[PDB]
From a paper:
Proper operation of the pivotal CME cargo adaptor AP2 requires membrane-localized Fer/Cip4 homology domain-only proteins (FCHO). FCHO1 and FCHO2 are similar in overall domain arrangement —folded N-terminal acidic phospholipid-binding homodimerization F-BAR domains and C-terminal folded μ-homology domains (μHD) separated by a ~300-residue, low-complexity intrinsically disordered protein linker, which has been suggested to participate in AP2 activation, although how it does so is undetermined.
The Y pocket is variously filled by parts of the tags of an adjacent Cμ2 molecule. Isothermal titration calorimetry (ITC) measurements showed the binding of FCHO2-N1+N2 to have a KD of ~25 μM. Mutation of key binding residues in Cμ2 (E320A+E321A+K326A) reduced binding fivefold, and mutating Tyr323 to serine rendered it unmeasurably weak. The weak density that follows on from N1 adopts a range of conformations forming crystal packing contacts, which we believe to be nonphysiological (mutations FCHO2 Y340S and E336A+F339S have little effect on N1-N2 binding).
Residue numbers in the entry: 152 to 219, 240 to 437, 477 to 489, 497 to 502
Amino acid sequence: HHHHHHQIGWRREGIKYRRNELFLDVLESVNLLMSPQGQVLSAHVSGRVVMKSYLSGMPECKFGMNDKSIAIDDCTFHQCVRLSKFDSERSISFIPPDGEFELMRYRTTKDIILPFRVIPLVREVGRTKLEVKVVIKSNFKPSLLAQKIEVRIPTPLNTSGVQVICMKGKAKYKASENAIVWKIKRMAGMKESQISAEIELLPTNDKKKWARPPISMNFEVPFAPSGLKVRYLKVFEPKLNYSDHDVIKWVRYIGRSGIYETRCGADVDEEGYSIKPETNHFYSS
């Protein structure tokens, strides 16, 4: 009974790391079309899990998710994942490639945590004025902070001048872009902010009702709008004898805005050790 030799094409043998560790990045884009009254007309999240594996040997990994939450409509796995166990047990088990790879990508349309509601109100005062007020609510944990928030409010062509007021961030009228651009650096959850706009209009000869573009928003969020949460990443190397109890896990959720709209009334060193790449923690290089 001679035994076969196991050669995996995506991971060589003899990977040695001074410090066993791994990175998990849950990257997601949330998309939205919301009515002016707050009705979700469309919404979806595309996401993927990027793993950087700086582990030694041939480690056996089991990635655990908060799904028996996140409702997954369809997902494609990297070849390393054992498709048999995900069929029956819903387990994600693999010996990962060395370095960075995409463990899975997925799509979500249900139970989506929309990080921002935009409540718009545009009032008409004759053909020479247009009074705009826009509120944004952050509907996540107060513990968390959103970055790079930008709100785009469309202005009609015949805008002759705007005076804008806000108490958060900055708001500049960009006539070439036909928009008021409202940039906020940071904002916590369960909060509100508001912008005020008095827009002056030159009346035209049409009296054709202005067909509004939607109000769009850009932002980053430190969680997954799909609701996905990393429960565990168990590791076991049988030959070197180490488990995830001996490993450092670095986990990060980056939630991005995709099209988020709301209508407004319309490698090895000398000794055989692999070197990590480079780019404030007690254990980071």
